Symmetry: C2
Subunit: 361 residues, 2 copies
Amino acid sequence: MVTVAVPKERAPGERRVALVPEVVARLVKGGARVRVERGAGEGAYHPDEAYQEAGAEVVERGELLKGAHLLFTVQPPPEDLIQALEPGAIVVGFVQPHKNLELVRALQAKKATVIAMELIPRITRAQSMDALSSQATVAGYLAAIHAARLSPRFFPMLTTAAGTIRPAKVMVMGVGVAGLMAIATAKRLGAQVFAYDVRKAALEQALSLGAKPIELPISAELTEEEKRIQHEALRDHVAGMDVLITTAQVPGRRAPILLTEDMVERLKPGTVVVDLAAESGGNCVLTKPGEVVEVRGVRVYGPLNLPSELSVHASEMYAKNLYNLSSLLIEKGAFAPKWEDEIVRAALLMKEGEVLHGPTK
Amino acid sequence: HMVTVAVPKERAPGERRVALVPEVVARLVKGGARVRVERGAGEGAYHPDEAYQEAGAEVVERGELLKGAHLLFTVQPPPEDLIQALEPGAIVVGFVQPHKNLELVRALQAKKATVIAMELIPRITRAQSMDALSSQATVAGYLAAIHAARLSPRFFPMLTTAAGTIRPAKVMVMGVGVAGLMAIATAKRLGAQVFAYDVRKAALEQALSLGAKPIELPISELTEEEKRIQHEALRDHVAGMDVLITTAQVPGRRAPILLTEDMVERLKPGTVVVDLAAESGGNCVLTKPGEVVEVRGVRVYGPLNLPSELSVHASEMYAKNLYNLSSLLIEKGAFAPKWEDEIVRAALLMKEGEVLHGPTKALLG
């Protein structure tokens, strides 16, 4: 019987847990032993007794990794955990070396095997394992809820004896997984929703949700005069918005600027911007990550760690992702890694201490 | 011949609404009235001084605001600096809440002021367009549901992805007045499974129409044994909820407790309570007004000045309420109060310093 260890997350403001009690039960039922650090689930509103009822050994941190073949985490494991990894153990979780370089060197110094959840490939067989996607959906939902929280206007159209109020104009810029959920959530709320993306397919997905595609003069590589035309057109469309939600990120780079000062300049007092790219510097020139700022009556919010806000469902989805990935790591309750499976091969950052990923090395 | 209306910057802590917004100022000036607006009055509601000037209002220093003004339109009651500058014969029109602002009421009677308390507009169909309590409740109820979504660790809507199915949040709105109905409508939009609790079958019918499920308790006053059976049943339903939004308030009196200690103890970690009755002590025993607290993993929020959060639209509907009311105060642009209109008689709190409202007379002695 294989044993899987789950730690309490320690990164500043992290509230998720890698496995929730309902997933623990299914693992235990299949044959695995599960060890869960005391209080691991408290950020996600899962008390120790729920893990205990599920069949987990709830244990002190320091006893967590004893006899563990698998360590499931959300963020990369801190040095204290790494130093307790038994040889041949596999660490599964987000690793993000760009934000976690010291921990990567430490892991490789200690010679583990690690599967980086952000490396799970985007093939149809791996959809159920896509943690990037499940946490994006969470972020996109919350971006819309925060936009409604921050706006001094109603999202929906409203008619009372006092008169008629128009719905809010919301533009989602960057229509990936998070952007699509932001569209759906704003649309639900009754906003007039507009979608900006350079990908025609992303715009198609947006139309199916009832968003209006923004169609710029150069139809979805631009010369530096075609950019003036594009930019002006986009500036004109953005000017009319009450809410902007921006989601465009590029892995290990500065987030692209989508909202320049000449665009912010034209926003009316009371307009809100929710910049989901705050972690890599933000899509808006005014964003201060972790903060709300207000300039000329435009409020610009740069959320960090949005999935921790939705700690119950962000954890459930992530747990389900790991549980589905676990089919390739566990057979009939036994440690049985499918080293030749394309999903495992793609997401494997190291095997017995040797790095296999290029950009990280 | 023409009347002047004064609009101050609000000064009460947390207050961001303004009594008139530029669109309404424009209609008044077009009607022949003059309007003066204190510098910065509109800034909380995102209306700069220039918008008021464009609408036809004079923008002026606070010390100058009330000069030659027969009408003063406010959100919260005027602070003493303003009361001191009122002309005699001038009418103050705003929320007053005397129990909370007794010293201001005292100063208004000493100045011999005439005041129409917006919270006293009668609940008649004729006054529906003037009902500030209703328009501000609609705002509060909307924001209750938004804040519930912001505070909850779970999704409101059902979600199916390749990672599985997530059930919709279970949301109970307790007290199905104007605010409650908008909380229902907004939680429903968001995809929650919404439940409604209210002792009024009519409230329950309105809720049902928005697609909420009426909570049906065993007893369709009531004995102590009956209230025990009703309570155990209510406690059972509540214990199953992810979100409780409470809205029950009684004019000039402590909020009824709808969530007792024994009920909150049955709530699962991660449940959220949004208590709209915080300003009068709260429907929930755990509520700390102006704060979010958490006990045993239950987060309890007691918002104060929710309408100030939605300052653009809270202000617009309020200004329109005042505009609609002004039909009974202004005629072809001139000061012409209809003293004998039932609406005016009902909402007049004092006239030339004479307090006309009974409960207020009691506090004053």
